[PDB]
Amino acid sequence: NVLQIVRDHWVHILVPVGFVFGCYLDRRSDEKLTAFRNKSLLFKRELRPNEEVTWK
Amino acid sequence: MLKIIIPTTMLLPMTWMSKHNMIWINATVHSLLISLISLSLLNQLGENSLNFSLTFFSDSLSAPLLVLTTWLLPLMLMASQSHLSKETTTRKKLYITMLILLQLFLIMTFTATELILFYILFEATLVPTLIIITRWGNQTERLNAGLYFLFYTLAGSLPLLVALVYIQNTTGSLNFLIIHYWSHPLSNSWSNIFMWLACIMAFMVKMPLYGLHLWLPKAHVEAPIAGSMVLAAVLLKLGGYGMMRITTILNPLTNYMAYPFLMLSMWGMIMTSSICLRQTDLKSLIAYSSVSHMALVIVAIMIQTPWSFMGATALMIAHGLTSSMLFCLANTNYERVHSRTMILARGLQTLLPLMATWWLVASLTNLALPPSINLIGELFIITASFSWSNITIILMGMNMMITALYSLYMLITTQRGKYTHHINNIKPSFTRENALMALHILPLLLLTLNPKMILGPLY
Amino acid sequence: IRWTYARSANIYPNFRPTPKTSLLGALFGIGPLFFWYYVFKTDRDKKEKLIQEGKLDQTFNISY
Amino acid sequence: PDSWDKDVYPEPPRRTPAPAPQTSLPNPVTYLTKIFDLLVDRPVTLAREFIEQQHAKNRYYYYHREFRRVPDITECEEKDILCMFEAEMQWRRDYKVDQEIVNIIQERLKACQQREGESYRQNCAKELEQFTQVSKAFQDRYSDLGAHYSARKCLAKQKQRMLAERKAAKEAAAA
Amino acid sequence: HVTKDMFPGPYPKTPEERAAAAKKYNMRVEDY
Amino acid sequence: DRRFLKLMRFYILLTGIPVAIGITLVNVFIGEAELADIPEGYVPEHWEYFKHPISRWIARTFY
Amino acid sequence: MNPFASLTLTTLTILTIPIMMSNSNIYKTNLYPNYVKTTVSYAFTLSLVPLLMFMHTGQEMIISNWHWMTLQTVELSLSFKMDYFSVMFIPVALFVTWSIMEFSMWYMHSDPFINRFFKYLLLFLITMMILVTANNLFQLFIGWEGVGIMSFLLIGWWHGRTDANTAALQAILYNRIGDIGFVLSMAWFLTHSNAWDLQQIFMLNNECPNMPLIGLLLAAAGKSAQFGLHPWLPSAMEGPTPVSALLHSSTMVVAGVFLLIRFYPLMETNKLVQTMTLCLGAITTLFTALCAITQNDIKKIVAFSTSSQLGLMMVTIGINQPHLAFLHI
Amino acid sequence: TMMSGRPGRVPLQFLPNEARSLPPPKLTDPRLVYMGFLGYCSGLIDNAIRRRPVVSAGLHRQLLYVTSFVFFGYYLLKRQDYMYALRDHDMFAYVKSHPEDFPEKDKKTYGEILEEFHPVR
Amino acid sequence: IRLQEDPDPEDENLYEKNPDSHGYDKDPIVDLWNMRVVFFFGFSIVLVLGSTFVAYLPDYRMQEWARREAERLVKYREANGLPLMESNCFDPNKIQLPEDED
């Protein structure tokens, strides 16, 4: 029954929501370490005509 | 890494708002789901590491231990489901909370790019374990066991804090990457000798080294089942992981500072293997077996050769899984028998055949049978020690023979022979125990197909 | 139960330090350690001396 | 097969004798080989042809990654962590390449020894010499570095060896 | 369900103590 | 014991059989990329340096 | 092309099918022993062909199909060696096992767990086949431990009998004493010749020193029940008669002599090890024959006869005639 | 460090005027979230001690705890950031004003530096 | 009597009141569903899908890349007569050795 199983099975959504939040936080934290993107002496590459960043 | 840490944290509100009769189901399902997420970390590269951020990084040494840690929790829940039947809802939720906190602390410990954070979580892993041992323990000696486990660890690990802050004051950073790249030789001086001792003793006490192992039989015997498996499987590997991480700055002093510990371990392996032969208890026998295997791991780490490190990692994982299985089987026997004595119940193979099969498989794996990863790690360490000195083979072979002897003694005394007459409450084994044994053993026989996943960074 | 208690948990409270017990403890807990240390130290010293002189023929000893 | 280059894995021309039946007694080996061909090789070949023609209908490529060269640890500053990192990664890659070179030489040695039969002691002298040379070079390069090996330690080992050999050469010349 | 007296005790010099221990272990006094 | 064995076999097969069938289909219809030189002026994606199609899919999707 | 490799792998593969089927329905009927016997007979009649091809041409081959793992400069792969020894010992072992299984179908008709007995026999046969056809020391060690474990499981067939458990543990003890020397040899070979493969070991060791050969001799003495470690073979008769007829008579106990045969290129180069193995063989054959003179249990007498024959082939190895020892096997 | 006697310091100012020259912490700062979590924990403990339904006894009280903790945490973070900025400013000014005590290291390359090699055997 | 205490209760057999007990819980429905989810998420989802995922992990360790590089290096050095592996890891000219003059 809708709106009845929710009051008993709302706890199951907690862990996957936490996983998605963790993935988002990991990407956001990775966004702060772009001080050498496409500046590495080994992977220094000329950008593609329709490319703005080497990686996200 | 936060994709792993965050769900483990969310396990707590999930458990605390669950219904009174559905906590075990939810905890088991979401713990298994978390383990699947942790599998992604295993794909390491031959280069430096998976540097996730400034606080967490993953290597090919941390990946197998992390996967094992995440995998152990569902098994702990299935093991604890038995003796917590008559427990109130709040106390069961507190037990699951302690287990979840232990897993979270271990997960944060194993990456811990900075050494002070590693130490903080390495000591944080001590509170939930002590609470579990001293609260949900059957015997009246659980209090003394908890005191021994706390103080043996803390006395060793307290000088480590001073050593670490001193290193930070002189070197200037405790980040493991900077520590590895800027490492400089340690001159032969009394101050450097004591720095070596401070940095090493904290991890050698937890492994444990022979002569400081008195806390382990007590902690393993008096603890509940889940505490026993988490002690034998993961908590013993903290010392070895820390030692392999920290020996990068102790060279070349180790070249001659390893002699006392090498001799102690190479003789204590024989001593504890012999002790296992004359034992009136099952859990004590398994604990002493764990001491012997960890002494071998200590020898491997102190040798400091690539084959030594590979064998040490393989033996770590294999011994963790095997000891967890053996403790599970002993607990299943104790639940029906209620005595915990090896010779009180005999001939159980006639009454419980499948559990006899599980006993045989666990004993064979403990016996270091090829091509299981137990023997892979064993043989790698044997070859490395042989390269170190040709005379170690005598001690290692003696240990192998005694290990086979006590493993088959454990199997024969409890499984073969005529059943005891005055015991008539040996009910048929449940599906839960069989599933627990299967989930313990199948990963071992699966990992024997892909050894490179557990051979460490020096593969 | 009495046998198990006597074997395991009743050893220390009835223990007294006597010349026989002390001598046996010192011997059986110290002698093997120093014996093995001396043996391994001598072997490794000999090996290192041979290495320094260079007369060991370590060819093909790639893995270590 | 063209899957592997013939020059890196050399193989002798593998000359084989011709059948010279001395007697009229029919040998069972030829009959067994014929029937085995008939009812084993044909179905296997048809299945492989079907699979290959299925593969040909969808073809795509994968490429070998090429790595640029970066300054070694010899031209790296004392505390310049970035150049040290680049040189260390390059040294690790070179270490792996050297290990695979030694593996290739060992494979050639084992193959020659098994192929030559009872005259392996004589007919594979060249392979043993190549393995000896490569093994000595590898042992001089990477042996005794320890579990915590790094580019700095290998460079220090090379410097110590160069000092030893320079002192020996100077002593020999001045004698 | 076992009392403290049943458990093993320290060696006793006195005969009365010896007798008590022999009875505890279910054996004759002069057989102990 | 027989019931436990039956349940374990049933679940293991219930997942493995679709996995084995899918693996066989992918191997027989799409698998085994061949190795070719990098075209001039073209930079491949990070997942184009692997052979098996399942490995390429894993690398593209997750890493 | 060249059906040698195909058939020499197919025999070992077809020996494995009943083990896979052991969880099927046929395991729960009385058709299982006949099924296993027919499978063994078919494997024998299939493996008979590579013997003919070797006899006609002199075919020799090694197959390294699956690459297990690479440790820096060492490579471990699932390698099978199909030389004269392997291609000749496959049919003999399969023939003897077929006869023993057909005999057991009558001897053990009253045993409720007859299907498990046949499954154990097949597992032992598979492990011995792995040991015989092994090409590197690790696979040989796998077979070496597998045959010992199967012997432990089959000696103590009757769990109620205490003497059965005692004999099983005694056999394991002596086999581990031999495994000490086996592991010593393995470690020495890897740390000096940089390979566990037989080819590199043969090539890189022109003058084999004393240590690896002494380790190999200790392992052979342990598993072939020589004078130092003989009693486990006579004590291993607590098991059923078919087990002692197949395992501890003709197939499993010749594993040490077969190991010494396999390393004959290194045995000839050393004179002290040849003398030591000749002396060991002589003393053990005399001792077991003398003991068998006055024995009163028939199985004990035949076990001591087996020990004497094992000592005789060790003597044959000592005088540097390995092929004659293989023929006597 | 002992910045108590630092010249030009107002005796009892929580946040000097110059501290306005620094970026304020974001409202989504992890430390502020931690203060909010501490406030929520205090609310739960308060409910537990009073023997009330722990999760849902007083929503206003829990909200007040969270808000007070967030407020104090925000101001404390501002003061902490200002003090650390002061320490770094003093450090850099002193190292600039005393060039003799902090000489420029003669940059060297690993090629011309002899480090002893200790083999592992 | 030293104190007031409940008698030690006897262990409750899970089979007596419920055959097909699975050893999970005394409530048959919750017990059965616990068994189902444990078997499905342990064996079916993790132990099989995860095993296949680990089996088919992309080669980030660069084993085939190292093999190809070694093949190219060996071919080039054999064709031109170079002595294969080089004794010095780093070229001598770049390195500077402090003079002794002793």
Ligand SMILES: CCCCCCCCCCCCCCCCC[C@@H](O)O[C@H](CO[C@H](O)CCCCCCCCCCCCCCC)COP(=O)(O)OCC[N+](C)(C)C
């Ligand atoms: C025939 C096929 C055979 C092989 C099948 C293999 C299937 C493997 C399935 C198991 C996967 C194991 C889990 C892997 C988790 C690690 C990777 C994960 O963290 O990645 C996340 C992504 O995860 C996925 O989005 C979700 C996968 C979770 C579910 C896996 C499938 C099985 C789930 C089963 C759950 C229960 C099913 C229902 C039961 C009732 C975040 O990725 P992100 O860091 O952004 O990537 C950046 C790089 N980009 C930009 C190129 C992407």
Ligand SMILES: CCCCCCCCCCCCCCCCC[C@@H](O)O[C@H](CO[C@H](O)CCCCCCCCCCCCCCC)COP(=O)(O)OCC[N+](C)(C)C
């Ligand atoms: C009990 C269970 C196990 C616990 C842990 C056991 C491990 C702890 C053992 C400590 C390891 C070695 C300590 C010192 C090693 C240095 C080598 C030294 O001992 O040998 C001689 C040193 O001579 C003497 O040993 C001086 C020290 C004597 C005093 C130390 C106490 C010795 C016995 C105490 C044992 C107690 C151990 C347990 C304490 C609770 C060499 O003389 P020298 O070449 O000139 O000096 C070398 C050092 N230099 C180069 C820096 C100058």
Ligand SMILES: CCCCCCCCCCCCCCCCC[C@@H](O)O[C@H](CO[C@H](O)CCCCCCCCCCCCCCC)COP(=O)(O)OCC[N+](C)(C)C
């Ligand atoms: C009941 C009676 C028997 C019935 C069963 C009959 C069937 C027999 C089959 C049983 C064994 C037969 C052997 C067959 C092996 C073939 C499969 C093998 O080759 O694949 C392995 C692959 O298997 C996996 O690598 C091993 C499993 C991964 C281990 C993870 C465990 C699962 C997670 C659970 C938690 C772990 C806890 C411990 C943490 C460390 C080896 O991989 P590899 O040869 O290279 O190449 C794979 C393909 N490539 C080329 C594309 C790369």
Ligand SMILES: CCCCCCCC/C=C\CCCCCCCC(=O)O[C@H](COC(=O)CCCCCCC/C=C/CCCCCCCC)COP(=O)(O)OCCN
């Ligand atoms: C299970 C129980 C185990 C107990 C373990 C306890 C022993 C651990 C080893 C000693 C711990 C203390 C070491 C100090 C921490 C390291 C700090 C350091 O390295 O700094 C040194 C300082 O070194 C010291 O101060 C050491 C003093 C030790 C005092 C405390 C003694 C504790 C017991 C000593 C013997 C124990 C050794 C064996 C223990 C075996 C386990 C029982 C450098 O001094 P500087 O000031 O920088 O001088 C430079 C200018 N020349």
